Amino acid sequence: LSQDFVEALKAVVGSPHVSTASAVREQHGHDESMHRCQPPDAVVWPQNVDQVSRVASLCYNQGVPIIPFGTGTGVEGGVCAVQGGVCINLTHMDQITELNTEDFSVVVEPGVTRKALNTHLRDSGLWFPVDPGADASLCGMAATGASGTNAVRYGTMRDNVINLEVVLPDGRLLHTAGRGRHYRKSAAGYNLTGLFVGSEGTLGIITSTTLRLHPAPEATVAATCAFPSVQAAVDSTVQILQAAVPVARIEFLDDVMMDACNRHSKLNCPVAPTLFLEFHGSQQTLAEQLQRTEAITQDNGGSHFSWAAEKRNELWAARHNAWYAALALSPGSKAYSTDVCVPISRLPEILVETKEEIKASKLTGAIVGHVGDGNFACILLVDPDDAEEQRRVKAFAENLGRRALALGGTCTGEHGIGLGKRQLLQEEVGPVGVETMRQLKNTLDPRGLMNPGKVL
Ligand SMILES: Cc1cc2nc3c(=O)[nH]c(=O)nc-3n(C[C@H](O)[C@H](O)[C@H](O)COP(=O)(O)OP(=O)(O)OC[C@H]3O[C@@H](n4cnc5c(N)ncnc54)[C@H](O)[C@@H]3O)c2cc1C
């Protein structure tokens, strides 16, 4: 990367906001997954959207790849600089704007995390529900199409992103639903907002997101429920969903995950396949939801609910940290994760089969999942130096992905494709799907410089 080019970057954002130092590049060459660190040639911190546009135009016209970087909590290698280039760390733009409490909407810049937003919203009666376990950039969550424990009731990022501000690869500024616009529904033109949600930085740089806010629940109750078997826990889940109980959160942990979370968070739950549950409503609605849900879990052998502000907070913090709880089972390990999502009636077969396949292998695996969406993760720890053990892990991961595709499902419910699931995506949508996605990539990024090597 030439010295004239670095000086051009410094001319846009300022000398302190450009770095070519090896350590700084290495910190921006990986995310939270096992994908090997591939450091960008430089890291740049633009201070406003005009600077994002000018950095993008400089890179694009000089044939230099661009890698958008949020909080680096992704798990599919989205930020790995597989072709080098310039990593654009967006987190110094961290302002919340256009809070419209009467319209239940807000605009956030990439440095805003869900915890910052919900702190800002305290005493408003509103909250933002989409809750990945990591305190991630909200614009990064828009870019990956994230979901969370609350999505079963309150929707994913796709459901709660109203508008996006995007710097296209050549620097043009696009407001996907129109500048400043926010509304509940529209048929105006093609829906550009949904194209950029889940685009993982391959179609442009999200520089603000307009988010749907939700009313805080009148009352909340959380509980855990222990089951004699995975089959029993997942049958309960399916039957709760088919009974249309509007549960706010329904999270599955197998016994391995439960034990790991106990050891990592000082929970003391019985070591068993377990549901973490939460219910929202008034006192009447809560009592109704509870006995309909307790009736179903009892039929499948569930324990009486172990009830849990401080105690629910610890419960859900433990769940949100399950990734790190799994990693702490084998210190020094990194992890790959599966993320399949299947039609809910097929969830019992595939979870039980996955548990059986983990047992029949030499592999350490913890299962945790947004099973209310028919989604779950198998977190697979790896010795970073054990090459034979890594080939067994992606081999297991590909096979699980192909089993989900065989059931009519998808290889990723929320984490995305990045580097790891590109072959599965080709199988999932077929040749016409792949070519159509590639034609969209090509019109927005003709030179192929927008986070190359990812998704397609
Ligand atoms: C402990 C833990 C728990 C998690 N739980 C969940 C969960 O429940 N659900 C879930 O969906 N994910 C979960 N994740 C994954 C991760 O937090 C999400 O994918 C999150 O959306 C990543 O945001 P980020 O800014 O950290 O991404 P990064 O790693 O910085 O980037 C992710 C991808 O998006 C691109 N990108 C980032 N910001 C932008 C931007 N502004 N514009 C364009 N492209 C951009 C990057 O180029 C990359 O390809 C979890 C991760 C951890 C470590």
DSSP string covering 280-304, please? EE-HHHHHHHHHHHHHHHHHTTPPP
Query: Which pairs from 82-85 meet CB under 8 Å and 24+ separation?
Result: 82/38, 82/419, 82/452, 82/453, 82/454, 83/452, 83/453, 84/1, 84/40, 84/41, 85/40, 85/41, 85/59, 85/449, 85/452
The span from the CA of 117 to the CA of 106, in Å, is: 9
Which residue has its alpha carbon closest to ligand 1 atom 34?
Answer: 200
Q: Which atom of ligand 1 is nearest to the CA of 156?
A: 11
Distance 12 CA to ligand 1 centre (A): 27
Instruction: Count CB neighbours of 93 within 10 A.
Output: 20
Farthest CA pair distance, the chain: 70
DSSP-derived pairing of the beta strands 96-100 and 105-108: antiparallel
Distance 85 CA to ligand 1 centre (A): 20
Distance 350 CA to ligand 1 centre (A): 26
DSSP-derived pairing of the beta strands 274-281 and 96-100: unpaired
The span from the CA of 27 to the CA of 50, in Å, is: 25
Instruction: Count CB neighbours of 201 within 10 A.
Output: 27
The answer to whether the CB of 68 falls within 8 A of the CB of 408 is: no
Could you give the 3-state DSSP secondary structure of residue 250? strand
Distance 148 CA to ligand 1 centre (A): 12
Which alpha helices (DSSP H) does 205-345 contain, by range?
A: 230-242, 255-265, 283-299, 310-320, 322-327
**Cα-atom radius of gyration of the chain, to the nearest Å?**
22
Which domains, from first to last, does the chain contain?
A: 3-89 (3.30.43.10), 96-215 (3.30.465.10), 219-406 (3.40.462.10), 422-448 (no CATH)
Which residue of 28, 73, 147 sits with most ligand 1 atoms within 8 Å of its CB, as the best mutation to test the pocket? 73
CA distance from start to end of the chain: 26
DSSP-derived pairing of the beta strands 249-253 and 274-281: antiparallel
- Resolution of the determined structure in angstroms stands at 1.7
Ligand 1 site, CB within 6 A? 31-32, 67-75, 78-79, 90, 110, 132-134, 136-137, 139-141, 143-144, 146-148, 200-201, 205-206, 323-324, 414-415, 451, 454
The span from the CA of 159 to the CA of 217, in Å, is: 19
Q: Which atom of ligand 1 is nearest to the CA of 141?
A: 21
Q: What burial class does residue 189 get, using C-beta atoms within 10 Å of its C-beta: 0-12 exposed, 13-18 middle, 19+ buried?
A: exposed
**What angle, rounded to 10 degrees, do the helices at 310-320 and 255-265 form?**
120
Distance 29 CA to ligand 1 centre (A): 14
The answer to whether the CB of 237 falls within 8 A of the CB of 273 is: no
Q: Could you tell me which of 224, 260, 236 has the C-alpha nearest to residue 351?
A: 236
Could you give the 3-state DSSP secondary structure of residue 219? strand
What is the spatial order of strands in the sheet that 173-175 belongs to? Answer: 96-100, 105-108, 205-212, 161-167, 173-175
Distance 90 CA to ligand 1 centre (A): 13
Q: Could you tell me which of 279, 272, 232, 234 has the C-alpha nearest to residue 255?
A: 272
Q: Which helix (H) or strand (E) holds 53?
A: helix 49-61
What is the spatial order of strands in the sheet that 18-19 belongs to? Answer: 18-19, 42-44, 86-89, 66-69
How many alpha carbons fall within 13 Å on the CB side of residue 199?
A: 27
What are the Cα distances from residue 379, in Å, to 254, 256, 362?
A: 11, 11, 14
Distance 53 CA to ligand 1 centre (A): 22
Q: Could you tell me which of 428, 277, 436 has the C-alpha nearest to residue 342?
A: 428
